[PDB]
Amino acid sequence: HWGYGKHNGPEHWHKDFPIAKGERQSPVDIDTHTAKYDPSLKPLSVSYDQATSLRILNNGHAFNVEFDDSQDKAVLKGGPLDGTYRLIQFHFHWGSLDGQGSEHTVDKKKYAAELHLVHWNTKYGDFGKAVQQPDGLAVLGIFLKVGSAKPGLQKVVDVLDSIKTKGKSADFTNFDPRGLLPESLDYWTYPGSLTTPPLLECVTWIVLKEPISVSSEQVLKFRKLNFNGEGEPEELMVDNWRPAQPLKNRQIKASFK
Ligand SMILES: N#Cc1cccc(-n2cc(-c3ccc(S(N)(=O)=O)s3)nn2)c1
Ligand SMILES: [Zn+2]
């Protein structure tokens, strides 16, 4: 089906998902000199104190840590958003080498990986409805660079060997996503899309300026994951990122100067 290889990767997605060539696709390069500071932007509110994680899943494209979103336990508000967006899952995109991996780029710089905290607009009632709306999702994007270890990531790294292959899951309760955030919440924002099929144009992207540092040992363990199912030939889960797409008729706004 779709994936990230030569024969089914991003340059092929458009044949099944014509919106791949649409007017508001993600990711994009963030040109920091042309992004405009917007005083209209209220401060971001990340309220993850009551977050309830449940499970971690290898879905054959990435791994997802899933949250209980049956009530407003972990939400994103403020910044460019109106209303309340509920955390449903986070996941990452990463490279085969430390010079690549992120989806968004900053003045053409690629980071080693990129974290996506995925939230849906509660006025649409459920995720599947929210994705059919231009303001249905808000994804908080955070770059990772390789340096010192991120203590708050290590519980995730340590469960990966239990979900090596596609379709494997493990219990993942009592995980605190506040441990993945950098100190600053300064951000860029723009309207865009899911960066995987079905590439729906339903996302308010909020990308943090400050990356988090992770260790080489941490990132290496992401790279031991498998795209394949158990008992199939091993294909390492690496380079599961989509490259930057045309900005078209969009302006990236900055919360800071
Ligand atoms: N409920 C539900 C449900 C069922 C199937 C899939 C999903 N679901 C899909 C996604 C996403 C696909 C791409 C992204 S991305 N890389 O953040 O733009 S998030 N996030 N949750 C959610
Ligand atoms: Zn993603």
UniProtKB/Swiss-Prot annotation:
Cofactor mode of binding and number, as noted: Zinc. Can also use cobalt(II) with lower efficiency, but not copper(II), nickel(II) and manganese(II).
Tagged with keyword Lyase: yes
Consequence of substituting residue 103 to D: Normal CO(2) hydrase activity
Recorded superkingdom: Eukaryota
SUPFAM superfamilies per UniProt: Carbonic anhydrase
Effect of residue 91 to C/D/E/N/Q: Strongly reduced CO(2) hydrase and p-nitrophenyl acetate esterase activities, impaired stability of zinc binding
Effect the entry attributes to changing residue 139 to H: Impaired activity
Alpha-carbonic anhydrase domain segment(s): 1-256
Mutation effect (residue 61 to A): Reduced CO(2) hydrase activity, rescued by 4-methylimidazole (4-MI). Reduced proton transfer. Enhanced proton transfer. Enhanced proton transfer capacity
Effect of residue 62 to F: Reduced activity
Protein's name according to its UniProt entry: Carbonic anhydrase 2
Source taxonomy: Eukaryota, Metazoa, Chordata, Craniata, Vertebrata
Gene behind the chain: CA2
